[PDB]
Amino acid sequence: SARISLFAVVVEDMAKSLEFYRKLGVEIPAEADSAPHTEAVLDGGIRLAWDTVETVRSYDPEWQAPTGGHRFAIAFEFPDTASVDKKYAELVDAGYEGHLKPWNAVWGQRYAIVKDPDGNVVDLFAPLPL
Amino acid sequence: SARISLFAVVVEDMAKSLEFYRKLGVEIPAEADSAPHTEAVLDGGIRLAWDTVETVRSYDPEWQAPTGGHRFAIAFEFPDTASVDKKYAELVDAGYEGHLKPWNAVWGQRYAIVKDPDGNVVDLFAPL
Ligand SMILES: [Cu+2]
């Protein structure tokens, strides 16, 4: 059967998107900033990819950015709770959308939510000490 | 160090979504159909998660389904071009939306695009 190979996000501006993800530890060569397509190889070989809007329009010419809630989220795990709070403050200070400030989630994790430059939700979390 | 642990999708109906993904090789127990949240482990330990709209609104009350083009796409790899065509045909026959029929993409892969039950774009591909 098939295997999940890539999770790809559509970006209005490659440089601005990669800039955000680099702050989250994704390894992306500076040069990628000017590319129409970029991809980073993650654990197990699965890749996270980025494709510019103009690039997406090659097969979906009528594509237009959506408005509203997220249908997709990428969750980043941190070594401890303080790291979560620190990264959230860093991203918010950098002008990114702080959706839900750090809090002790009822499911047992220090949790926080921000949105990337294109409206995708990005969760930051760390297991709460037991 | 920050590491991507999960990729998650918001679903209106868990059972319907899992039904579609089970047809794409994702191993998911039947009991997950009744859960408010589900996780499937992929390679490298990364997990794909499904959260019902209700689950999302429990901590994100203002969430509203988006309107407009897709913000993302999940791409599934097949062993050969024939299997891509076969899967596209199968899913379309099964009532799922066929977005773009199979073709030989400029990037060197047999490619086809369908939509899952929640309108998400799902790419099917194989090296030529
Ligand atoms: Cu090559």
Side-chain angles (χ1 to χ4, degrees), chain A residues 1-10 24 42-44 46 48 56 59-60 63-79 99-100 103 107 113 118-120 125, chain B residues 1-12 24-25 42-44 46 48 56 59-60 63-78 99-100 103 107 113 118 120 125:
Chain A
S1 41
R3 78 179 33 91
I4 288 181
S5 194
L6 311 91
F7 282 95
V9 295
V10 180
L24 286 165
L42 311 168
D43 305 285
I46 291 178
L48 172 59
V56 167
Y59 48 86
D60 276 11
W63 191 97
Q64 295 295 352
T67 49
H70 68 293
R71 284 240 75 95
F72 168 75
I74 304 173
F76 290 79
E77 180 165 349
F78 292 82
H99 194 59
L100 281 180
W103 89 99
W107 55 93
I113 308 176
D118 293 280
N120 299 291
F125 77 90
Chain B
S1 262
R3 324 241 53 233
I4 291 172
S5 271
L6 307 98
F7 280 107
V9 288
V10 182
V11 301
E12 174 189 4
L24 285 169
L42 320 169
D43 286 336
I46 296 170
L48 170 54
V56 170
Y59 57 86
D60 195 358
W63 184 89
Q64 290 263 57
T67 299
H70 62 284
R71 284 202 181 93
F72 76 113
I74 307 177
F76 289 77
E77 177 168 8
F78 292 75
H99 181 64
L100 276 178
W103 86 97
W107 49 93
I113 304 167
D118 289 277
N120 300 310
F125 75 89

Coordinates of all heavy atoms in Angstrom, one line a residue, chain A residues 1-10 24 42-44 46 48 56 59-60 63-79 99-100 103 107 113 118-120 125, chain B residues 1-12 24-25 42-44 46 48 56 59-60 63-78 99-100 103 107 113 118 120 125:
Chain A
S1 N 0.9 -1.2 0.0 CA 0.0 0.0 0.0 C 0.9 1.2 0.0 O 2.1 1.2 0.2 CB -0.9 0.0 1.2 OG -0.2 -0.4 2.4
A2 N 0.2 2.4 -0.2 CA 1.0 3.7 -0.2 C 1.6 4.0 1.1 O 1.3 3.3 2.1 CB 0.0 4.8 -0.6
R3 N 2.5 5.0 1.1 CA 3.1 5.5 2.3 C 3.1 7.0 2.3 O 3.3 7.6 1.2 CB 4.6 4.9 2.4 CG 5.6 5.7 1.5 CD 6.9 5.1 1.7 NE 6.9 3.6 1.9 CZ 6.9 2.7 1.0 NH1 7.0 3.0 -0.3 NH2 6.9 1.4 1.3
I4 N 2.9 7.6 3.5 CA 2.9 9.1 3.5 C 4.4 9.5 3.3 O 5.3 9.1 4.0 CB 2.4 9.6 4.9 CG1 0.9 9.3 5.0 CG2 2.8 11.0 5.1 CD1 0.3 9.8 6.4
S5 N 4.5 10.4 2.3 CA 5.9 10.8 1.9 C 6.1 12.3 2.3 O 7.2 12.6 2.8 CB 6.0 10.6 0.4 OG 7.4 10.7 0.0
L6 N 5.2 13.2 2.0 CA 5.4 14.6 2.3 C 4.1 15.3 2.8 O 3.0 14.9 2.5 CB 5.9 15.3 1.1 CG 7.0 14.9 0.2 CD1 6.5 14.0 -0.9 CD2 7.7 16.1 -0.4
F7 N 4.4 16.3 3.6 CA 3.3 17.2 4.1 C 3.8 18.5 3.5 O 4.9 19.0 3.8 CB 3.3 17.3 5.6 CG 2.7 16.1 6.3 CD1 3.5 15.0 6.7 CD2 1.3 16.0 6.5 CE1 2.9 13.9 7.3 CE2 0.7 14.9 7.1 CZ 1.5 13.8 7.5
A8 N 3.0 19.1 2.6 CA 3.3 20.3 1.9 C 2.4 21.5 2.2 O 1.2 21.3 2.1 CB 3.4 20.0 0.4
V9 N 3.0 22.6 2.5 CA 2.2 23.8 2.7 C 2.4 24.8 1.6 O 3.5 24.8 0.9 CB 2.6 24.5 4.0 CG1 2.3 23.6 5.2 CG2 4.1 24.9 4.0
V10 N 1.4 25.6 1.3 CA 1.4 26.6 0.2 C 1.8 27.9 0.9 O 1.3 28.3 1.9 CB 0.0 26.7 -0.4 CG1 0.0 27.8 -1.5 CG2 -0.5 25.4 -0.9
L24 N 11.9 27.4 14.4 CA 11.4 26.2 15.1 C 12.3 25.0 14.9 O 11.9 23.8 15.2 CB 10.0 25.9 14.6 CG 9.0 26.9 15.1 CD1 7.7 26.8 14.3 CD2 8.7 26.6 16.6
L42 N 12.6 14.9 7.4 CA 12.4 14.7 8.8 C 12.7 13.3 9.2 O 13.2 12.5 8.5 CB 10.9 15.1 9.2 CG 10.4 16.4 8.7 CD1 8.9 16.4 8.9 CD2 11.1 17.5 9.5
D43 N 12.3 13.0 10.5 CA 12.5 11.6 11.0 C 11.8 10.6 10.1 O 10.8 10.9 9.6 CB 11.9 11.5 12.4 CG 12.4 12.6 13.4 OD1 13.5 12.5 13.9 OD2 11.6 13.6 13.6
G44 N 12.5 9.5 10.0 CA 11.9 8.4 9.2 C 11.9 8.7 7.7 O 11.5 7.8 6.9
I46 N 10.2 11.1 6.1 CA 9.0 12.0 5.7 C 9.6 13.4 5.6 O 10.4 13.9 6.3 CB 7.9 12.0 6.8 CG1 7.3 10.6 6.9 CG2 6.9 13.0 6.5 CD1 6.2 10.5 8.0
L48 N 8.8 17.7 4.9 CA 7.9 18.8 5.1 C 8.4 19.7 3.9 O 9.5 19.9 3.7 CB 8.3 19.6 6.4 CG 7.5 20.9 6.6 CD1 6.0 20.7 6.5 CD2 7.9 21.6 7.9
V56 N 1.9 26.6 -7.1 CA 0.7 25.8 -6.9 C -0.3 26.0 -8.1 O -1.0 25.1 -8.6 CB 0.0 26.1 -5.6 CG1 -1.4 25.5 -5.5 CG2 0.9 25.5 -4.5
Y59 N -0.9 23.9 -11.5 CA -1.9 22.8 -11.7 C -3.3 23.2 -11.1 O -4.3 22.7 -11.5 CB -1.4 21.5 -11.1 CG -0.9 21.7 -9.7 CD1 -1.8 21.6 -8.6 CD2 0.5 21.9 -9.4 CE1 -1.3 21.8 -7.3 CE2 1.0 22.0 -8.1 CZ 0.1 22.0 -7.1 OH 0.5 22.2 -5.8
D60 N -3.3 24.2 -10.3 CA -4.5 24.8 -9.6 C -4.5 26.3 -9.9 O -4.4 27.1 -9.0 CB -4.5 24.5 -8.1 CG -5.0 23.1 -7.7 OD1 -5.2 22.3 -8.6 OD2 -5.2 22.9 -6.5
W63 N -6.4 28.9 -7.7 CA -6.2 28.9 -6.2 C -6.1 30.3 -5.6 O -5.5 31.2 -6.2 CB -4.8 28.2 -5.9 CG -4.6 27.9 -4.5 CD1 -4.8 26.7 -3.8 CD2 -4.1 28.8 -3.5 NE1 -4.5 26.8 -2.5 CE2 -4.0 28.1 -2.3 CE3 -3.6 30.1 -3.5 CZ2 -3.5 28.7 -1.1 CZ3 -3.2 30.7 -2.4 CH2 -3.1 30.0 -1.1
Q64 N -6.7 30.4 -4.4 CA -6.8 31.7 -3.7 C -6.6 31.3 -2.2 O -7.2 30.4 -1.8 CB -8.1 32.5 -4.0 CG -8.3 32.9 -5.4 CD -7.3 34.0 -5.9 OE1 -6.5 34.5 -5.1 NE2 -7.3 34.3 -7.1
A65 N -5.9 32.1 -1.5 CA -5.7 31.9 -0.1 C -7.0 31.8 0.7 O -7.9 32.7 0.4 CB -4.7 32.9 0.5
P66 N -7.1 30.9 1.6 CA -8.4 30.8 2.4 C -8.4 31.7 3.6 O -7.4 32.4 3.9 CB -8.4 29.4 2.8 CG -7.0 29.0 3.0 CD -6.2 29.8 2.0
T67 N -9.5 31.8 4.2 CA -9.7 32.6 5.4 C -10.4 31.7 6.4 O -11.1 30.8 6.0 CB -10.6 33.9 5.2 OG1 -11.8 33.5 4.5 CG2 -9.9 34.9 4.4
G68 N -10.2 31.9 7.7 CA -10.8 31.0 8.6 C -9.9 30.1 9.4 O -8.6 30.2 9.2
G69 N -10.4 29.2 10.2 CA -9.7 28.3 11.0 C -8.8 27.3 10.2 O -8.8 27.2 9.0
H70 N -7.9 26.6 10.9 CA -7.0 25.7 10.3 C -7.6 24.3 10.1 O -8.5 23.9 10.8 CB -5.8 25.5 11.2 CG -6.1 24.8 12.5 ND1 -6.8 25.4 13.5 CD2 -5.7 23.6 12.9 CE1 -6.9 24.5 14.5 NE2 -6.2 23.4 14.2
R71 N -7.2 23.6 9.0 CA -7.6 22.3 8.7 C -6.4 21.4 9.0 O -6.5 20.2 9.1 CB -8.0 22.2 7.2 CG -9.3 22.8 6.8 CD -10.2 21.7 6.2 NE -10.8 20.9 7.3 CZ -12.0 21.1 7.9 NH1 -12.7 22.1 7.5 NH2 -12.4 20.2 8.8
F72 N -5.3 22.0 9.2 CA -4.0 21.3 9.4 C -3.1 22.0 10.4 O -3.0 23.3 10.4 CB -3.3 21.2 8.0 CG -1.9 20.8 8.0 CD1 -1.5 19.5 8.3 CD2 -0.9 21.7 7.7 CE1 -0.2 19.0 8.2 CE2 0.5 21.3 7.6 CZ 0.8 20.0 7.8
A73 N -2.4 21.2 11.2 CA -1.5 21.8 12.3 C -0.3 21.0 12.4 O -0.3 19.7 12.2 CB -2.2 21.8 13.6
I74 N 0.8 21.6 12.7 CA 2.1 21.0 12.8 C 2.5 21.2 14.3 O 2.5 22.3 14.8 CB 3.2 21.6 12.0 CG1 2.8 21.6 10.5 CG2 4.5 20.9 12.1 CD1 3.7 22.4 9.6
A75 N 2.7 20.1 15.0 CA 3.0 20.2 16.5 C 4.5 19.9 16.8 O 5.0 18.9 16.5 CB 2.2 19.2 17.2
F76 N 5.2 21.0 17.4 CA 6.6 20.9 17.7 C 6.7 20.6 19.2 O 6.1 21.3 20.1 CB 7.3 22.2 17.4 CG 7.4 22.4 15.9 CD1 6.4 22.9 15.2 CD2 8.7 22.2 15.3 CE1 6.5 23.2 13.8 CE2 8.8 22.4 14.0 CZ 7.8 22.9 13.2
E77 N 7.5 19.5 19.5 CA 7.7 19.2 20.9 C 9.0 19.7 21.5 O 10.0 19.7 20.8 CB 7.7 17.6 21.1 CG 8.0 17.2 22.5 CD 7.6 15.7 22.7 OE1 7.0 15.1 21.8 OE2 8.0 15.2 23.8
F78 N 8.9 20.2 22.7 CA 10.1 20.8 23.4 C 10.5 20.0 24.6 O 9.7 19.2 25.2 CB 9.8 22.2 23.8 CG 9.6 23.1 22.6 CD1 8.4 23.2 21.9 CD2 10.7 23.9 22.2 CE1 8.3 24.0 20.8 CE2 10.6 24.7 21.1 CZ 9.4 24.8 20.4
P79 N 11.8 20.1 25.0 CA 12.3 19.3 26.1 C 11.7 19.6 27.5 O 11.7 18.8 28.4 CB 13.8 19.6 26.1 CG 13.9 20.9 25.3 CD 12.8 20.9 24.3
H99 N -1.9 32.8 18.7 CA -3.3 32.3 18.8 C -3.8 32.0 20.2 O -4.8 32.5 20.7 CB -3.5 31.1 17.9 CG -4.9 30.8 17.7 ND1 -5.8 31.7 17.1 CD2 -5.7 29.7 17.9 CE1 -7.0 31.1 17.0 NE2 -6.9 29.9 17.5
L100 N -3.0 31.2 20.9 CA -3.4 30.9 22.3 C -2.1 30.9 23.1 O -1.2 30.1 22.9 CB -4.1 29.5 22.4 CG -5.5 29.5 22.0 CD1 -6.1 28.1 22.2 CD2 -6.3 30.5 22.9
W103 N -0.2 27.7 28.2 CA -1.0 27.3 29.3 C -0.9 25.8 29.6 O -0.3 25.1 28.8 CB -2.5 27.6 29.0 CG -3.3 26.6 28.3 CD1 -4.2 25.7 28.9 CD2 -3.4 26.4 26.9 NE1 -4.8 24.9 27.9 CE2 -4.4 25.3 26.7 CE3 -2.8 26.9 25.8 CZ2 -4.7 24.9 25.4 CZ3 -3.1 26.5 24.5 CH2 -4.1 25.4 24.3
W107 N -5.0 18.2 29.0 CA -4.5 16.8 28.6 C -3.1 16.5 29.1 O -2.5 15.5 28.6 CB -4.7 16.6 27.1 CG -4.0 17.6 26.2 CD1 -2.7 17.6 25.7 CD2 -4.6 18.8 25.7 NE1 -2.5 18.6 24.9 CE2 -3.6 19.4 24.8 CE3 -5.8 19.5 25.8 CZ2 -3.9 20.6 24.1 CZ3 -6.1 20.6 25.1 CH2 -5.1 21.2 24.3
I113 N -0.2 28.0 21.0 CA -0.5 27.9 19.6 C -0.2 29.2 18.9 O -0.6 30.3 19.4 CB -2.0 27.5 19.4 CG1 -2.3 26.2 20.2 CG2 -2.2 27.3 17.9 CD1 -3.7 25.8 20.1
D118 N 1.2 31.9 6.7 CA 0.2 31.5 5.8 C -1.1 31.0 6.4 O -2.0 30.5 5.7 CB 0.7 30.6 4.7 CG 1.7 31.2 3.8 OD1 1.3 32.0 2.9 OD2 2.9 31.0 4.0
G119 N -1.3 31.1 7.7 CA -2.5 30.7 8.4 C -2.5 29.3 8.9 O -3.5 28.9 9.5
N120 N -1.4 28.6 8.7 CA -1.3 27.2 9.3 C -1.1 27.3 10.8 O -0.3 28.1 11.2 CB -0.2 26.4 8.6 CG -0.5 26.3 7.1 OD1 -1.4 25.6 6.7 ND2 0.4 27.0 6.3
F125 N 4.6 22.4 22.4 CA 4.3 21.7 23.6 C 5.4 20.9 24.2 O 6.4 20.6 23.6 CB 3.1 20.7 23.3 CG 3.5 19.5 22.6 CD1 3.9 18.4 23.3 CD2 3.5 19.4 21.2 CE1 4.3 17.2 22.6 CE2 3.9 18.3 20.5 CZ 4.3 17.1 21.2
Chain B
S1 N 15.8 20.3 22.1 CA 15.6 20.9 20.7 C 14.2 20.6 20.2 O 13.7 19.4 20.3 CB 16.7 20.2 19.8 OG 17.8 21.1 19.6
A2 N 13.6 21.6 19.6 CA 12.3 21.4 19.1 C 12.2 20.4 17.9 O 13.1 20.4 17.0 CB 11.8 22.7 18.5
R3 N 11.3 19.4 18.0 CA 11.1 18.4 17.0 C 9.7 18.3 16.6 O 8.8 18.3 17.5 CB 11.7 17.1 17.5 CG 12.9 17.1 18.4 CD 14.1 16.4 17.8 NE 14.4 16.8 16.5 CZ 14.5 15.9 15.5 NH1 14.3 14.6 15.7 NH2 14.7 16.4 14.2
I4 N 9.4 18.1 15.3 CA 8.0 17.9 14.9 C 7.6 16.5 15.4 O 8.2 15.5 15.1 CB 7.9 17.9 13.3 CG1 8.2 19.4 12.8 CG2 6.5 17.5 12.9 CD1 8.3 19.5 11.3
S5 N 6.5 16.5 16.2 CA 6.0 15.3 16.8 C 4.8 14.8 16.1 O 4.5 13.6 16.0 CB 5.8 15.4 18.3 OG 7.0 15.1 19.0
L6 N 3.9 15.7 15.7 CA 2.7 15.4 15.1 C 2.2 16.3 14.0 O 2.6 17.5 14.0 CB 1.5 15.3 16.1 CG 1.7 14.4 17.3 CD1 2.2 15.3 18.5 CD2 0.4 13.7 17.6
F7 N 1.5 15.8 13.0 CA 0.9 16.5 11.9 C -0.5 16.2 12.2 O -0.8 15.0 12.4 CB 1.3 16.0 10.5 CG 2.7 16.4 10.1 CD1 3.8 15.5 10.1 CD2 2.9 17.7 9.7 CE1 5.0 15.9 9.7 CE2 4.2 18.2 9.2 CZ 5.2 17.3 9.3
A8 N -1.4 17.2 12.3 CA -2.8 16.9 12.7 C -3.8 17.5 11.7 O -3.5 18.6 11.2 CB -3.1 17.4 14.1
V9 N -4.9 16.9 11.5 CA -5.9 17.4 10.6 C -7.2 17.5 11.4 O -7.5 16.6 12.2 CB -6.2 16.5 9.4 CG1 -5.0 16.6 8.4 CG2 -6.3 15.0 9.8
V10 N -8.0 18.5 11.1 CA -9.3 18.7 11.8 C -10.4 18.0 11.0 O -10.6 18.3 9.8 CB -9.6 20.2 12.0 CG1 -10.9 20.4 12.7 CG2 -8.5 20.9 12.7
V11 N -11.2 17.2 11.7 CA -12.2 16.4 11.0 C -13.6 16.6 11.6 O -13.8 16.6 12.8 CB -11.9 14.9 11.0 CG1 -10.6 14.7 10.3 CG2 -11.9 14.4 12.4
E12 N -14.6 16.8 10.7 CA -16.0 16.9 11.1 C -16.5 15.6 11.6 O -17.3 15.6 12.6 CB -16.8 17.4 9.9 CG -18.3 17.5 10.1 CD -19.1 17.8 8.8 OE1 -18.5 17.8 7.8 OE2 -20.3 17.9 8.9
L24 N -5.6 4.3 2.1 CA -4.3 4.8 1.6 C -3.2 4.2 2.4 O -2.1 4.8 2.6 CB -4.3 6.3 1.7 CG -5.1 7.0 0.5 CD1 -5.3 8.5 0.8 CD2 -4.4 6.7 -0.8
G25 N -3.4 3.0 2.9 CA -2.4 2.2 3.6 C -2.2 2.6 5.1 O -1.3 2.0 5.8
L42 N 3.8 7.1 12.1 CA 4.4 6.9 10.8 C 5.9 6.7 11.0 O 6.3 6.4 12.1 CB 4.3 8.2 10.0 CG 2.9 8.9 10.0 CD1 3.1 10.3 9.4 CD2 1.9 8.1 9.3
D43 N 6.7 6.8 9.9 CA 8.1 6.6 10.0 C 8.8 7.6 10.9 O 8.4 8.8 10.9 CB 8.7 6.5 8.6 CG 8.4 5.3 7.9 OD1 8.1 4.2 8.5 OD2 8.4 5.3 6.6
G44 N 9.9 7.2 11.6 CA 10.6 8.1 12.4 C 9.9 8.5 13.7 O 10.4 9.4 14.4
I46 N 7.1 10.1 14.0 CA 6.2 11.2 13.7 C 4.8 10.6 13.7 O 4.6 9.5 13.1 CB 6.5 11.9 12.4 CG1 7.9 12.6 12.6 CG2 5.4 13.0 12.2 CD1 8.4 13.2 11.3
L48 N 0.5 11.0 12.7 CA -0.5 11.8 12.0 C -1.7 11.7 13.0 O -2.0 10.7 13.5 CB -0.9 11.1 10.7 CG -2.1 11.6 9.9 CD1 -1.9 13.1 9.7 CD2 -2.3 10.9 8.6
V56 N -11.3 20.3 18.9 CA -10.7 21.6 18.6 C -11.3 22.7 19.4 O -10.6 23.5 20.0 CB -10.6 21.9 17.1 CG1 -10.2 23.3 16.9 CG2 -9.7 20.9 16.4
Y59 N -10.8 23.9 23.3 CA -9.7 24.9 23.7 C -9.5 26.0 22.7 O -8.8 27.0 22.9 CB -8.4 24.1 23.9 CG -7.9 23.4 22.7 CD1 -7.1 24.0 21.7 CD2 -8.2 22.0 22.5 CE1 -6.7 23.3 20.6 CE2 -7.8 21.3 21.4 CZ -7.0 22.0 20.4 OH -6.6 21.3 19.3
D60 N -10.2 25.9 21.5 CA -10.2 26.9 20.5 C -11.6 27.1 20.1 O -12.0 26.8 18.9 CB -9.4 26.3 19.3 CG -9.0 27.4 18.3 OD1 -9.3 28.6 18.5 OD2 -8.3 27.1 17.3
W63 N -12.9 28.5 16.6 CA -12.5 27.9 15.3 C -13.7 27.8 14.4 O -14.8 27.5 14.8 CB -12.0 26.4 15.6 CG -11.5 25.7 14.4 CD1 -10.3 25.7 13.9 CD2 -12.3 24.9 13.5 NE1 -10.2 25.0 12.7 CE2 -11.4 24.5 12.4 CE3 -13.6 24.5 13.4 CZ2 -11.9 23.7 11.3 CZ3 -14.1 23.8 12.3 CH2 -13.2 23.3 11.3
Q64 N -13.4 28.1 13.1 CA -14.4 28.0 12.0 C -13.8 27.4 10.8 O -12.7 27.8 10.5 CB -15.0 29.4 11.7 CG -15.8 30.1 12.8 CD -17.3 29.9 12.5 OE1 -17.8 28.8 12.4 NE2 -18.0 31.0 12.4
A65 N -14.4 26.5 10.2 CA -13.9 25.8 9.0 C -13.5 26.9 8.0 O -14.3 27.8 7.7 CB -14.9 24.9 8.4
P66 N -12.3 26.8 7.4 CA -11.8 27.8 6.4 C -12.5 27.7 5.1 O -13.0 26.7 4.7 CB -10.3 27.5 6.3 CG -10.2 26.0 6.6 CD -11.3 25.7 7.6
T67 N -12.5 28.9 4.4 CA -13.2 29.0 3.1 C -12.1 29.5 2.1 O -11.5 30.5 2.3 CB -14.3 30.0 3.1 OG1 -15.3 29.6 4.0 CG2 -14.9 30.2 1.7
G68 N -11.9 28.7 1.0 CA -10.9 29.1 0.0 C -10.0 28.0 -0.4 O -10.4 26.8 -0.1
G69 N -8.9 28.3 -1.0 CA -8.0 27.2 -1.4 C -7.3 26.5 -0.3 O -7.3 27.0 0.9
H70 N -6.8 25.3 -0.5 CA -6.2 24.5 0.5 C -4.9 25.1 1.0 O -4.2 25.7 0.2 CB -5.9 23.1 0.0 CG -4.9 23.0 -1.2 ND1 -5.3 23.4 -2.5 CD2 -3.6 22.7 -1.3 CE1 -4.3 23.2 -3.3 NE2 -3.3 22.8 -2.6
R71 N -4.6 25.0 2.2 CA -3.4 25.6 2.8 C -2.3 24.5 2.8 O -1.1 24.9 2.9 CB -3.6 26.0 4.3 CG -4.4 27.2 4.5 CD -4.1 27.8 5.8 NE -4.8 29.1 6.1 CZ -6.0 29.1 6.7 NH1 -6.5 27.9 7.2 NH2 -6.6 30.2 7.0
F72 N -2.7 23.3 2.6 CA -1.7 22.2 2.6 C -2.2 21.0 1.8 O -3.3 21.0 1.3 CB -1.5 21.7 4.0 CG -2.6 20.8 4.5 CD1 -2.4 19.5 4.8 CD2 -3.9 21.4 4.7 CE1 -3.5 18.7 5.2 CE2 -5.0 20.6 5.1 CZ -4.8 19.2 5.4
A73 N -1.3 20.0 1.7 CA -1.6 18.7 1.0 C -0.7 17.6 1.6 O 0.4 17.8 2.0 CB -1.3 18.9 -0.5
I74 N -1.3 16.4 1.7 CA -0.6 15.3 2.2 C -0.3 14.5 0.9 O -1.3 14.2 0.2 CB -1.4 14.4 3.2 CG1 -1.9 15.3 4.3 CG2 -0.5 13.3 3.8 CD1 -2.8 14.6 5.3
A75 N 0.9 14.1 0.7 CA 1.3 13.3 -0.5 C 1.7 11.9 -0.2 O 2.5 11.7 0.6 CB 2.4 14.1 -1.2
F76 N 1.0 11.0 -0.9 CA 1.2 9.5 -0.6 C 2.0 9.0 -1.8 O 1.7 9.2 -3.0 CB -0.1 8.8 -0.5 CG -0.8 9.1 0.8 CD1 -1.5 10.3 0.9 CD2 -0.8 8.2 1.8 CE1 -2.2 10.6 2.1 CE2 -1.5 8.4 3.0 CZ -2.2 9.6 3.1
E77 N 3.1 8.2 -1.5 CA 3.9 7.6 -2.5 C 3.5 6.1 -2.8 O 3.3 5.3 -1.9 CB 5.4 7.6 -2.1 CG 6.3 6.9 -3.2 CD 7.8 7.2 -3.0 OE1 8.1 7.8 -2.0 OE2 8.6 6.8 -3.8
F78 N 3.4 5.8 -4.1 CA 3.1 4.5 -4.6 C 4.3 3.8 -5.3 O 5.3 4.5 -5.6 CB 1.9 4.6 -5.6 CG 0.6 5.0 -4.9 CD1 0.4 6.3 -4.6 CD2 -0.3 4.0 -4.6 CE1 -0.7 6.7 -3.9 CE2 -1.5 4.4 -4.0 CZ -1.7 5.8 -3.6
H99 N -9.8 15.5 -7.9 CA -9.4 16.8 -8.2 C -8.7 17.0 -9.5 O -9.1 17.9 -10.3 CB -8.5 17.4 -7.0 CG -8.1 18.8 -7.2 ND1 -9.0 19.8 -7.3 CD2 -6.9 19.3 -7.4 CE1 -8.3 21.0 -7.5 NE2 -7.0 20.7 -7.6
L100 N -7.7 16.1 -9.7 CA -7.0 16.1 -11.0 C -6.6 14.7 -11.3 O -6.0 14.0 -10.5 CB -5.7 17.0 -10.9 CG -5.9 18.5 -11.1 CD1 -4.5 19.2 -10.9 CD2 -6.4 18.8 -12.5
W103 N -1.6 12.1 -14.3 CA -0.8 12.7 -15.4 C 0.6 12.5 -15.1 O 1.0 12.2 -14.0 CB -1.2 14.2 -15.6 CG -0.5 15.2 -14.8 CD1 0.5 16.0 -15.2 CD2 -0.9 15.7 -13.5 NE1 0.9 16.9 -14.2 CE2 0.0 16.7 -13.1 CE3 -1.9 15.3 -12.6 CZ2 -0.1 17.4 -11.9 CZ3 -2.0 16.0 -11.3 CH2 -1.1 17.0 -11.0
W107 N 7.6 17.3 -12.8 CA 8.6 16.9 -11.8 C 9.0 15.4 -11.9 O 9.6 14.9 -10.9 CB 8.2 17.3 -10.4 CG 6.8 17.0 -10.0 CD1 6.5 15.9 -9.3 CD2 5.6 17.7 -10.1 NE1 5.1 15.9 -9.0 CE2 4.6 17.0 -9.5 CE3 5.3 19.0 -10.8 CZ2 3.3 17.5 -9.5 CZ3 4.0 19.4 -10.7 CH2 3.0 18.7 -10.1
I113 N -4.6 13.9 -8.0 CA -5.0 14.5 -6.8 C -6.5 14.3 -6.4 O -7.4 14.5 -7.3 CB -4.8 16.1 -6.9 CG1 -3.3 16.3 -7.1 CG2 -5.2 16.8 -5.6 CD1 -3.0 17.8 -7.6
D118 N -13.1 15.9 4.3 CA -13.2 17.2 4.9 C -12.7 18.2 3.9 O -12.5 19.4 4.2 CB -12.4 17.3 6.2 CG -13.1 16.6 7.3 OD1 -14.0 17.2 7.9 OD2 -12.7 15.4 7.6
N120 N -9.8 18.2 2.2 CA -8.4 18.4 2.1 C -7.8 17.8 0.9 O -8.3 16.7 0.4 CB -7.7 17.7 3.4 CG -8.2 18.4 4.7 OD1 -8.2 19.6 4.8 ND2 -8.6 17.5 5.6
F125 N 1.3 9.8 -5.8 CA 2.3 9.9 -6.8 C 3.2 8.6 -6.8 O 3.3 7.9 -5.9 CB 3.2 11.1 -6.6 CG 4.1 11.0 -5.4 CD1 5.4 10.5 -5.5 CD2 3.7 11.5 -4.1 CE1 6.2 10.4 -4.4 CE2 4.5 11.3 -3.0 CZ 5.8 10.8 -3.2

